[PDB]
RNA sequence: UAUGUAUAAAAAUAGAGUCCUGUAUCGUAGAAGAUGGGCGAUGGUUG
RNA sequence: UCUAGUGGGCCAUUUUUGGUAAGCAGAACUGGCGAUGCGGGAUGAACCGAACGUGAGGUUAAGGUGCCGGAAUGUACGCUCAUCAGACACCAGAAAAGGUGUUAGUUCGAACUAGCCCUGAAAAUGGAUGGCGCUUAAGCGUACUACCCAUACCUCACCGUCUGGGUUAAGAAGCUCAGACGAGUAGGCAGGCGUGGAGGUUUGUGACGAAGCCUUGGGCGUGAGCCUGGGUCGAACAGCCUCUAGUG
RNA sequence: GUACGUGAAAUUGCUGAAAGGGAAGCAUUGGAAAUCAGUCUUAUAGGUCAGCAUCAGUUUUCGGGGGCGGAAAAAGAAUAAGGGAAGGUGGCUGUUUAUAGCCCUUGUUGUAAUACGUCCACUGGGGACUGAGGACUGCGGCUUGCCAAGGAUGCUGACAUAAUGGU
């Protein structure tokens, strides 16, 4: 119930761990979510919704971008039905240089910039958004609210 | 037949094959219909707080 | 064709109508217990509830260092394995038996839920010497049809109000293979019940015992 | 629930089997233990019944070879050790490892006593014993069953408490000016809904 | 269907470890004071039916296939017709060229050899 | 977890007493089972009716009236020893009748090493007049003027940084 | 540098155990700050990782990890019970433990 | 075995120098922490 | 119906005989041990709980939760200060009488009656509430929750036995559905594994390496055992059906 | 190579590997090191290990709403009366609501509430283990198709590795 769209959550796995993003659609099963891209570089991407801590933070408009273009095919990687795959040329190869269309460039810069109004009236959301969570001693999940 | 033993309790389609009554069933009922007309009599109470 | 299936949706019917008149059978004598208790203490007399008929008999010790009358009457109870409960109607040839007992057993007077809990959780059938769950009514079909007892709704009335046929109701039933009590039981689980043990005669309790092995 | 890299505790005026008995238990969950003024830990019971108990204690010896017979030590950090060891599985490799986790000293070495010490509420002799009751200190025990530098720990002991007192006073000093200037920001009130 | 096995340690005899005159194979104990007899805690357990396997798995390999000991080619046609349930395995005592014969046998079978190589 | 019931019971009719009479006590049992059990218990040892022969006519639980008031109950009880040969009256300060019962079983059990067994209620009642109280420290709980220091202060988290103040 | 550590520590205890037998199949787990059955029943189902350090860099990484999930409470103190993939060696009782924040229920 | 490898009065407990523990204080925002700029301070962290 | 083993017993409860006594001799009823593991009693053949196929999960018995040790340095009210306290049944042993010990009670300041403690109490390698230690207990009495875990109970998977229901469309000596159950010495019975020789069989293996041997290799079976890769070797050997015995 | 076919075990020397604080050996579980095979590689379908979702079976743990029962809880509150004494308030050690109050009895609000007991074929979460079986049959529900109804599928990613597993 608590991941409302436009809500700003925490990511507790991957490459962006303890980044803080904003909700931006439910998808099926995880969360179409982003971060102002101009703020802590997280682009569009889906986050299981096990992977994500709600915070009571005031809610950001996000009914003003679209969401219905987030899809899984849109989302989805490239076929392989091959096991033969890796290469250093490959790893040169992908990078957000190379492939990461335009298209999709300008639906982040869009999205971007449809989200800077709200975070800009909100006052110390800009900077909450960059900055990353990170638990130092003596604080314990259980009694903290987020 | 009957691989698997579903508790008809924690499962509503095999309580419903067990028991065609469930669907009818209306646990809760307003019997005192808000009025509750005490009954105790005084020679009960002085029994009751006797010594 | 549809002959078999019109037939059984009828048949079905009858089986909601016999079960909504349990239901208020219960509910009316309920009512008719509370309202003479009522007027009893209202007009300063005394109203006795009746006697239970109906008793639910568990098996508290293991089958290690027993005397062989104790032995052979747990044995005539079908009380062959520790944590094993069944239903026995409750007059003086059965008090005088589980008197013998006591140390060994405890039973006390079940309730509607109790009943119905346990054969529907744990409702088996002894169907060709065999131990049949009641997942369907077509199985007491087969076995007590002829006594009409038609559904497990029929089967839970004359468990509980001790019908003519009980015997052959509760001979029906395999002995329910409870589990251990949630919670344990008391410190000294053999003692009798008055010394705050766990054997013997424990009244209604055997209710909050059965909502724990259940 | 809590865990340090390192724990140093101030035994005065803790009983010995209550600390011993936390102590171990830490030793167990991994972490290693510093114990500091072990002469100043107290036994509930009077002295004499304690003296009587550890003359009881030094009865035990082999009857060929008392050199291979029980090793009766006299000072307060290795009684303390003692009791700790008597609690941790020390014939096992795992509750031997857990020994050497821990450090009882007598008095508190240069090492320790810049470094913060803290106390077993579970322990200490004040929580725990009914007033009235009398008790004895193992310093006192220790200098009657053989131990022999008692006077020099007092000595030590009474130096540092007065190098000690002069850095409190100085860190007093440093933190009334903080606490002067504290207030002068005009933030102490934009906190205060906070709780802050 | 997955292949499991209930246990996969064997069942040495006792003291097989500490004489060499007895020797690992499985004896089953019949002293009157023996421990593993009794199945005291901590000594070593016995063969038990219930350790048997599931009679669906049983006798096949890790890869779903039952071994077939094969002598020549005539062998390797018995398992023309079960090429999906048995795996062909040259005996001990077949000839390098027997063996050769076995395998292209096999290949063009389309049966799997346990030890082609 | 004791509770306070009321137990009527009687003999079953007979030709030789068609109208047998009621006897009734106030007795302290921790549920329904052992009140009975204890009601016959002292049935059976005064007026010849045995569980077997006789009947309980009612069952109530008695709730006491005015919990939220300070009172002193006298205890007469029938303590069973090694000796077997004592007779004790007690007095305990509280606001019902089912907790001076609890408490006066503790203390038997603490001072005098009795069981539920052991001791027997003879009579519970109210002293109502403060002179009617003989007990020293019951008077000296009925002083008008009573203030006493909070004993037993003691007041996980294994490790506290700071000498406890175990003070006011 | 206290930018990182998005898990809690935690503490190898022992095996689930009686007086003289073992279950190594499940781990006695002390999590830091946890004192309570009820506050352990936050930290249930959460992923607990055993990290340590080998010589032979596997995936080219110094670091291996055993993983595992917390299944439920043990005792009044707070401590729970875990199940790892690769039961942990009887070596690292006293070792520490990382429970990770999912997967989330706040 | 680390992830903030953060914290130094002595005391008494029928008293201590406001108390009724540290859930406190110190530190904490930045590609595991980038490249620039305007004001303000003359402090702060570190070779 | 035919036959094996046995025809030394032992312990506990309660009843009891002979006996100064006995871990003594002799009986009566029941349960155990012998033949029986497992959790608890520190440890122990018969004590307490519970009786055992292979495992997963859950919950319990007796017993326990200061540390060793899994689990509350829990809650409530008290008693106890012991110059070698006390600490859980069987059980590892103690008495009369006492106390300017203390806490309570009963009766006329006094006599008492009851709990705890102390005295009575008195041995020989150093030493045992199991150890450490414990004193508003981690002792003792009572109540109350929470928690720990047996091979016991519960649900499930699999193995085997037994039992019952199907199967003329399926090595019918086959296939298929279902339920219950699983300790074992002396002893019984069944089905299998392995060894030497004989009849039949396999277009069987083999000097392009039979048999045998060694092997930090691989696979199958609950097991007896079998198969195989590598090395060594040098002339024979095996599978299936049956026969036989100087067969482990 | 006549100390001669094959050349076993006991026992022994050398080499390599590891262990060793008053025995050793053994069982369970995993780490570490060493070693190895299956599997895939292919013919929409398939290899190894994971994460979530929706289900099923078993169980555990928190919470909510409701019905019924008891002296139709006992109390209490507010508001009307009577009576009472104190461990005595104001007034002067003594008295009876005053410049504090308490207790006892009775009515009204009241058909009060809460607690406890009990039931709901009432309901909201969190965690764990398990997925046996393999076209269709049945019993049910819904509206012919669908469905949580006679035992797990769906959507994805990483690695295709010594990863998992074996020794």
Not at chain 1, 108 to 114: I, N
Not at chain 4, 31 to 49: A, P
């Amino acid at each position: 119930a608590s991941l409302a769209p436009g809500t700003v959550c925490i990511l507790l796995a991957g490459r962006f761990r303890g980044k803080r993003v904003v909700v931006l659609s439910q998808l099926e099963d995880t969360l179409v979510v982003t971060g102002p891209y101009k703020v802590n570089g997280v682009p569009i991407r889906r986050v299981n919704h096990r992977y994500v801590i709600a915070t009571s933070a005031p809610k950001i408009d996000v009914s003003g971008v679209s969401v219905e273009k987030f899809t899984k095919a849109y989302f989805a990687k490239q076929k392989r039905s091959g096991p033969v795959k890796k290469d250093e040329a490959f790893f040169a190869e992908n990078a957000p240089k190379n492939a990461l269309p335009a298209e999709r460039i300008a639906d982040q810069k869009a999205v971007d910039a449809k989200l800077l109004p709200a975070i800009k009236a909100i006052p110390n959301m800009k900077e909450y958004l960059a900055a990353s969570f990170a638990l130092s001693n003596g604080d314990r999940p259980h009694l903290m609210k987020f | 037949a009957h691989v698997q033993k579903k508790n008809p309790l924690k499962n509503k389609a095999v309580l419903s094959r067990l028991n065609p009554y469930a669907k009818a069933y209306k646990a809760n009922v307003k019997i005192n219909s808000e009025k509750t007309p005490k009954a105790a009599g005084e020679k009960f109470l002085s029994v009751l707080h006797e010594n | 064709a549809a002959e078999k299936k019109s037939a059984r949706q009828k048949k079905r019917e009858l089986i909601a109508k016999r079960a909504e008149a349990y239901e208020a059978e219960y509910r009316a004598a309920e009512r008719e217990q509370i309202e003479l208790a009522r007027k009893a203490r209202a007009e300063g007399n005394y109203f006795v509830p009746h006697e239970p008929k109906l008793i639910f008999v568990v098996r508290i010790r293991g089958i290690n260092n027993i005397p062989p009358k104790a032995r052979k009457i747990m044995q005539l109870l079908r009380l062959l394995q520790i944590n094993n409960g069944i239903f026995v109607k409750f007059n003086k040839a059965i008090k005088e038996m589980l008197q013998v007992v006591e140390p060994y057993v405890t039973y006390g007077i079940p309730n509607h839920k109790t009943v119905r809990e346990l054969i529907y959780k744990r409702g088996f059938g002894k169907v060709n010497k065999q131990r049949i769950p009641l997942s369907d009514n077509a199985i007491i079909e087969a076995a007590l049809g002829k006594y009409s007892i038609l559904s497990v709704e029929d089967l839970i009335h004359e468990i509980y109000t001790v019908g003519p046929n009980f015997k052959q109701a509760a001979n029906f039933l395999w002995p329910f293979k409870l589990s251990s009590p949630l919670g344990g039981w008391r410190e000294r689980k053999f003692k009798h019940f008055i010394e705050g043990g766990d054997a013997g005669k424990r009244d209604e309790h055997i209710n909050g015992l059965v909502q724990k092995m259940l | 629930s809590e865990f340090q890299k390192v724990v140093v505790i101030d035994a005065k005026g803790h009983l010995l089997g209550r600390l011993a008995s936390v102590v171990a238990k830490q030793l167990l969950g991994g972490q290693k233990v510093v114990v500091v003024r072990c002469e100043e830990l107290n036994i509930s019971g009077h002295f004499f019944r304690n003296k009587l108990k550890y003359l009881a204690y030094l009865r035990k010896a082999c009857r060929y070879n008392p050199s291979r017979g029980a090793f009766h030590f006299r000072a307060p950090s290795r009684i303390f050790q003692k009791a700790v060891r008597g609690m941790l599985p020390h014939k096992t490799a795992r509750g031997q490892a857990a020994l050497e986790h821990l450090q009882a000293v007598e008095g508190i070495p240069p090492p320790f006593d810049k470094q913060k010490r803290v106390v077993v509420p579970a322990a200490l002799r004040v929580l725990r014993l009914k007033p009235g009751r009398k008790y004895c200190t193992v310093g006192r025990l220790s200098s009657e069953v053989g131990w022999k530098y008692n006077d020099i720990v007092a000595k030590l002991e009474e130096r540092r408490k007065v190098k000690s007192a002069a850095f409190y006073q100085a860190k007093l000093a440093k933190q009334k000016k903080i606490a002067s200037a504290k207030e002068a920001s005009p933030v102490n009130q934009k906190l205060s809904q906070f709780g802050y | 269907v997955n292949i499991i096995k209930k246990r996969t340690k064997p069942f040495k005899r006792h003291q097989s470890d500490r004489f060499k005159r007895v020797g690992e194979s499985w004896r089953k104990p019949r002293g009157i004071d023996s421990c593993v007899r009794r199945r005291f805690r901590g000594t070593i357990s016995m063969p038990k039916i219930g350790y048997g396997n599931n009679k669906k798995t049983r006798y096949c390999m890790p890869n779903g296939l039952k071994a077939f000991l094969v002598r020549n080619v005539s062998d390797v046609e018995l398992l023309l017709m079960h090429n999906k349930t048995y795996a062909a395995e040259i005996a001990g005592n077949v000839s390098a060229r027997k063996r050769v014969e076995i395998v292209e046998k096999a290949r063009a079978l389309g049966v799997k050899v346990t030890n082609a190589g | 977890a004791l509770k306070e019931y009321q137990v009527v019971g009687r003999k079953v009719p007979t030709e030789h007493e068609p109208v047998p009479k009621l006897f009734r006590m106030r007795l302290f049992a921790p549920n329904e089972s052992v009140a009975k059990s204890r009601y016959w218990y002292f049935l059976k040892m005064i007026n010849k009716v045995k569980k077997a022969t006789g009947e309980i006519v009612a069952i109530n639980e008695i709730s006491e009236p005015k919990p939220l008031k300070a009172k002193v109950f006298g205890i007469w009880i029938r303590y069973d020893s090694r000796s077997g040969t004592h007779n004790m009256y007690k007095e305990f300060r509280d606001t019902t009748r089912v907790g001076a019962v609890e408490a006066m079983y503790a203390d038997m059990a603490a001072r005098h090493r009795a069981r539920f067994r052991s001791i027997r209620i003879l009579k519970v009642v109210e002293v109502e007049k403060k002179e009617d109280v003989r007990r020293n420290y019951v008077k000296q709980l009925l002083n008008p003027h009573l203030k006493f220091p909070l004993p037993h202060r003691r007041t996980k988290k294994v490790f506290a940084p700071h000498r406890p103040s175990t003070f006011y | 540098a206290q930018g990182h550590r998005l898990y809690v520590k935690a503490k190898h205890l022992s095996f689930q155990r009686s007086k003289h037998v073992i279950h190594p199949g499940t781990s006695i787990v002390k999590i830091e700050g946890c004192d309570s059955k009820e506050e352990a029943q936050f930290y249930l189902g959460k992923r607990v990782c055993y990290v340590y350090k080998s010589s032979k860099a596997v995936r080219g990484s110094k670091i291996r990890v055993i993983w595992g999930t917390i299944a439920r409470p043990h005792g009044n103190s707070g401590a729970v019970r875990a199940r790892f993939v690769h039961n942990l060696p009887a070596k690292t009782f006293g070792s520490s433990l990382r429970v990770m924040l999912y997967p989330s229920n706040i």
